Amino acid sequence: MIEKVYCQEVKPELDGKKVRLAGWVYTNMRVGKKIFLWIRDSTGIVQAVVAKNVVGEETFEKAKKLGRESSVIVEGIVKADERAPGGAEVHVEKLEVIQAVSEFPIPENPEQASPELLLDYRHLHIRTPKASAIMKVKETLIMAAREWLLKDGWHEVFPPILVTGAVEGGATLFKLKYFDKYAYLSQSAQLYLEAAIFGLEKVWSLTPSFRAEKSRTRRHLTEFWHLELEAAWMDLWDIMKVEEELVSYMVQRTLELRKKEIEMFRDDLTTLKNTEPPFPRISYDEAIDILQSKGVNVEWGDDLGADEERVLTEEFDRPFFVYGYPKHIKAFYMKEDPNDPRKVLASDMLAPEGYGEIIGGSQREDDYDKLLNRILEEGMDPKDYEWYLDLRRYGSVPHSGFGLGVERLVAWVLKLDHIRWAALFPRTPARLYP
Amino acid sequence: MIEKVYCQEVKPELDGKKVRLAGWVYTNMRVGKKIFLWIRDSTGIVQAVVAKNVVGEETFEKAKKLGRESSVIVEGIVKADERAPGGAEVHVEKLEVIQAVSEFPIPENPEQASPELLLDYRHLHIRTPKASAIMKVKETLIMAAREWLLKDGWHEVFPPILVTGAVEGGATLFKLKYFDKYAYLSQSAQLYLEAAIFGLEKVWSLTPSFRAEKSRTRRHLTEFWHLELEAAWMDLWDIMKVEEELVSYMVQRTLELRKKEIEMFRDDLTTLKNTEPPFPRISYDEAIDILQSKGVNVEWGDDLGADEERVLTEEFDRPFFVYGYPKHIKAFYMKEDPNDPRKVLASDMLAPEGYGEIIGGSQREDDYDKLLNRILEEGMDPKDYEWYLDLRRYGSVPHSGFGLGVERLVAWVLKLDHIRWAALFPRTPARLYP
Ligand SMILES: NC(=O)C[C@H]([NH3+])C(=O)OP(=O)(O)OC[C@H]1O[C@@H](n2cnc3c(N)ncnc32)[C@H](O)[C@@H]1O
Ligand SMILES: NC(=O)C[C@H]([NH3+])C(=O)OP(=O)(O)OC[C@H]1O[C@@H](n2cnc3c(N)ncnc32)[C@H](O)[C@@H]1O
Ligand SMILES: [Mg+2]
Ligand SMILES: [Mg+2]
């Protein structure tokens, strides 16, 4: 490959040096007698100045016709100039047009288009600066998680996606034909992580999870990226400490590295800056009282839906925990509160500013008889869970874990109006394509 | 959480210090008047010495009954002793039996069991030392890949799993009902990575890929982990350089960190040590000649199946490339060799010692008309690929990429007898459970 110079490298200190740019036309404007092509690549935008008496009539005429997203190679000499973007421009000596484009279907400001058009052309939308900024934020949050997980001594595992058991209820399970049988798409790797702690003690995975959720909200995808941890020996309170340390590190590391991208989306970084341990903790009981005090018609035992969570977040300026939920609005695998068996040792972590749940976790039931009884009570077939019950037969230990919704976290960090914008190619009940 | 001391931390320098172990009984033997419990955790095995006159009759009797995989907490004093494992043992003061076990269904040497029994109890098999060693190797290879990818400036993305297009042929596609429509499970994220290079230039993903492969070989899973890279500007020769640099780094970093685990599986590390650039490169033409010279009944134009690849590997002592395949045994998206349009600019990387293909990659067709013609020739519906064709309409650039099978790589590194042992919970046509 003939090596290129990235746009971000075009700096005043390169004055007088030859560079080869490779990228796509961002804008094309005549300035005086010259053509100014702003060329974008994955690192920035550089002004390339095309002069007729330097490149010749043929090249000059070709340059006039280059619309947005035309692919080009540009060779020229860097000139330091304070008026130019980045303080330096390229005086073009050679222009190779790879493909001229004049009708790119995403507008220069994509948010002047209908969101439905942007989704119809999602494969083109992702190359635009704001959409790409979201993907850089997403990769940085995940990089940060892996740094924290490595340092704190967790083992990464690669759990199955094709499964035979519901983790989070049958209502949101995708079913498929699998040769001579049927399989489901995993809603969560949790049960497999619970198997893995017996060999590795502290484990995590990052997997796509699948939820056949009919409701078309701004917080639900049918496919999402799910960062899950499970640990031997830890109780609910221990796992909550892990959650706040991990999320704080993810957010602070991403503030450190991606300030520029975040400032494209936020006028106020306060809640992100506030994201350090210890996070506020309220009981579900306290949540109900806060909600009732603000006029919300909620009764103890009711689920906290998105609208309840929204009002609740008004009282907080950073992520916070709600803990100790009524048993029967939570999943079958959760350990009862030994002080009050009406409740389970569950906690959710909610983001402020209306975003609501980003993590769901719990301490797991570690008693065989109790777990089996709960499976039966929920109308589940113990045969589908025999292997999971085995974990309570062959050296059971107390353990806890949780799952983080990566897109939910990205949506809060960037104050997105819909979770879909945090997925490279979002999947929702009416959207499968591109 | 009351803090524990990991088995690996029990060292002679801790002589006289109190420790709290937490783990599972590995062996239980009476030695003289005492009970020696070897306790395993995720980091090793420590000898815990239980003396009747120290712990009392009740505890001593409980200790006698602890079989393999009994879960225990042990508090005691470290004593340096050269006869003990790791040069140090724990003199037990307190033993808490969490759950006594006597009938763990995996034998102490698992390979004395039928592989079918181990798979039936896969959730228990994964906690055993060899199986856990495979998972530590797998996580280290992947950690190494991410280190290399970060340093070399690639962006991580999170592509879709629910899709509408075959990347690697319709024969191995899983189909499912998706609300009012149908979806497929991704065979490969490649086409989406190709969209993403227009914004990010150099991208990668690690995703589960799904292949409805009926043939029950030792090299095929129906679900596998797929590390894929795609890069603007790079041709086939460029991407081959990336492949050998990445794989060499993965293997060398894993040799550095996981020598102990690898030596559980290999008597000879030579081929791993040999894995540094430049890898040998032979053309498909050369491969055919080598094969014909060794008596293999292969004709130019024929696919190189697993048995052909096996014989071919005999001539190599490290991974190697085969390049320049006949067009019609390769996928629709591959760029024709401009010097010889009977061929495409494809290469596979084969592991030695009979393992065969670990990477499939190519330069991609970047001309709209050629790609459309190929889609039509293969009986594919251009409507399902309109968005992919769009990438050749809106600023097309030359580009190349590849996919690495993580389990295939692990199987070669550890000289496994079947790829299934490299998956946490393997999926094959007859195996969906646990
Ligand atoms: N390992 C565990 O303990 C996780 C547990 N088994 C679990 O699946 O919990 P959830 O609360 O359903 O999901 C966990 C998180 O996953 C996200 N999530 C859950 N459903 C989601 C959906 N339909 N779309 C997008 N994100 C979704 C939310 O952030 C939620 O807090
Ligand atoms: N991004 C790309 O260019 C990849 C390309 N779209 C692709 O899917 O190529 P394959 O050669 O089919 O698969 C790539 C690798 O994926 C692995 N693989 C492919 N099929 C596999 C299977 N059924 N089981 C286990 N591993 C399998 C093999 O290592 C193979 O070399
Ligand atoms: Mg939840
Ligand atoms: Mg292949």
- Domains plus CATH for chain A? 1-104 (2.40.50.140), 105-434 (3.30.930.10)
- In this structure, what DSSP letter does residue A154 have? P
Backbone angles phi and psi of A217, in degrees to 5:
-80, 180
Ligand 3 center–CA A344 separation, angstroms: 14
CA distance A262 to B103: 56
Burial B54-92 (b: 16+ CB within 10 A, else e): ebeeebbebbeebebbbbbbbbbbbbebeebebebbbbb
Run of H or E including A285: helix A284-293
- In this structure, what DSSP letter does residue B3 have? -
Name the residue among A83, A108, A77 with its Cα closest to residue A31: A83
Where residue A404 falls (left for φ over 0; alpha for ψ -120 to 50; beta otherwise) is beta
CA distance A306 to B404: 41
CA distance B34 to B25: 16
How many CB atoms sit inside 10 A of residue B243's CB?
Answer: 25
CA distance A396 to A373: 17
- List the beta strands (DSSP E) in A213-334: 223-232, 281-283, 320-326
CA distance A47 to A36: 6
Q: What tokens appear for A238 in the block?
A: 């221990």
CA distance B143 to B131: 19
SS3 state of residue B288: helix
Q: Which residues contact A156 (CB under 8 A, 6 or more apart)?
A: A146, A149, A203, A204, A205, A206, B139, B142, B143
Name the residue among A388, A396, A371, A195 with its Cα closest to residue B99: A396
Where residue A179 falls (left for φ over 0; alpha for ψ -120 to 50; beta otherwise) is left
Where residue B56 falls (left for φ over 0; alpha for ψ -120 to 50; beta otherwise) is left
Q: What tokens appear for B238 in the block?
A: 């460029």
Backbone angles phi and psi of B156, in degrees to 5:
-80, 135
- In this structure, what DSSP letter does residue B21 have? E
Contact, A317 vs A292, CB < 8 A?
no
The residue type of A371 is L
Q: What tokens appear for B327 in the block?
A: 């067009």
For chain B, the 3-state helix, strand and coil shares in percent, each to the nearest 5, are: 35, 30, 35
DSSP secondary structure string for all residues of A341-391: TTEEEEEEEEETTTTEEEEEEEEBP--HHHHHHHHHHTT--GGGGHHHHHT
CA distances from A372 to A136, A230, A375, B145 (A): 45, 21, 5, 42
- Regarding the beta carbon of B166 and ligand 2, being less than 6 Å apart is answered no
Backbone angles phi and psi of A92, in degrees to 5:
-70, 130
- In this structure, what DSSP letter does residue B32 have? T
Nearest atom within ligand 2 for CA of residue B401: 3
CA distance B19 to B6: 9
Name the residue among B330, B281, B329, B287 with its Cα closest to residue B311: B287
Contact, B160 vs A223, CB < 8 A?
yes
Resolution, in Å, please?
A: 1.5
Name the residue among A326, A338, A394 with its Cα closest to residue A365: A338
Contact B427 A232 (CB under 8 A): no
Interface of A with B in 131-170 (CB under 8 A): 131-132, 135-136, 138-139, 142-143, 146, 150, 155-164
Is the backbone peptide bond immediately before A434 cis, with ω within 30 degrees of 0? yes
Half-sphere exposure of B411 (CA within 13 A, CB side): 28
Radius of gyration of chain A (CA): 26
* Inter-residue long-range contacts of A41-44, CB under 8 Å, 24+ positions, other chains counted: A41/A4, A41/A6, A41/A7, A41/B201, A42/A6, A42/A132, A42/B155, A42/B199, A42/B200, A42/B201, A42/B202, A43/A6, A43/A7, A43/A8, A43/A9, A44/A6, A44/A7, A44/A8, A44/A10, A44/A86
Q: Which residues contact A173 (CB under 8 A, 6 or more apart)?
A: A166, A184, A185, A187, A212
- Regarding the beta carbon of B168 and ligand 2, being less than 6 Å apart is answered yes
Dihedral sign for Cα atoms in the order B14, B17, B22, B23: positive
Length of chain B: 434
Residue with tokens 């949101």: A172
CA distance B21 to B88: 13
Name the residue among B163, B361, B148, B191 with its Cα closest to residue A126: B191
Name the residue among B385, B320, B319, B333 with its Cα closest to residue B362: B333
CA distance A201 to A199: 6
Contact, B21 vs B73, CB < 8 A?
yes
- Regarding the beta carbon of B309 and ligand 2, being less than 6 Å apart is answered no
Q: What tokens appear for B12 in the block?
A: 């002679």
CA distance A432 to B387: 13
**Ligand 1 pocket check: which of A209, A219, A335, A365 to mutate, most ligand atoms within 8 Å of Cβ?**
A209
DSSP secondary structure string for all residues of A15-72: TT-EEEEEEEEEEEEEETTEEEEEEEETTEEEEEEE-HHHH-HHHHHHHHT--TT-EE
CA distance B48 to B37: 5
Contact A207 B208 (CB under 8 A): yes
Q: Which residues contact B417 (CB under 8 A, 6 or more apart)?
A: B218
Length of chain A: 434
Please name every residue paired with B51 in a beta bridge, in sequence order, or none if there are none. none
Q: What tokens appear for A330 in the block?
A: 């939570």
Q: Which residues contact A68 (CB under 8 A, 6 or more apart)?
A: A24, A25, A26, A27, A28, A101, A104, A108
Radius of gyration of chain B (CA): 26
Q: Does A247 touch chain B (CB under 8 A)?
A: no
Residue with tokens 């893995």: A196
CA distance B262 to B5: 26
C-alpha B336 chain-centroid distance: 31
Rounded to 5°, angle at Cα B202 from B392 and A408 = 100
For chain A, the 3-state helix, strand and coil shares in percent, each to the nearest 5, are: 35, 30, 35
How many CB atoms sit inside 10 A of residue B94's CB?
Answer: 12
The residue type of B299 is E
**Ligand number with the minimum distance to the CA of A303:** 3
* 3-state SS track over B385-410: HHHHHHCCCCCCCCEEEEEEEHHHHH
Distance separating the N- and C-terminal Cα atoms of chain A:
31
Q: Does A308 touch chain B (CB under 8 A)?
A: no
Sheet with A343-351, strands from edge to edge, namely: A155-156, A202-210, A223-232, A399-405, A356-363, A343-351, A320-326, A281-283
Half-sphere exposure of B284 (CA within 13 A, CB side): 24
CA distances from A163 to A178, A359, B223 (A): 11, 22, 11
Q: Does B179 touch chain A (CB under 8 A)?
A: yes
Residue with tokens 């635009």: A128
Interface of B with A in 53-72 (CB under 8 A): 69-71
Q: Which residues contact B315 (CB under 8 A, 6 or more apart)?
A: B290
* Inter-residue long-range contacts of B299-304, CB under 8 Å, 24+ positions, other chains counted: B300/B326, B301/B326, B301/B328, B301/B329, B302/B329, B303/B329
CA distance A179 to B223: 13
Contact, B214 vs B238, CB < 8 A?
no
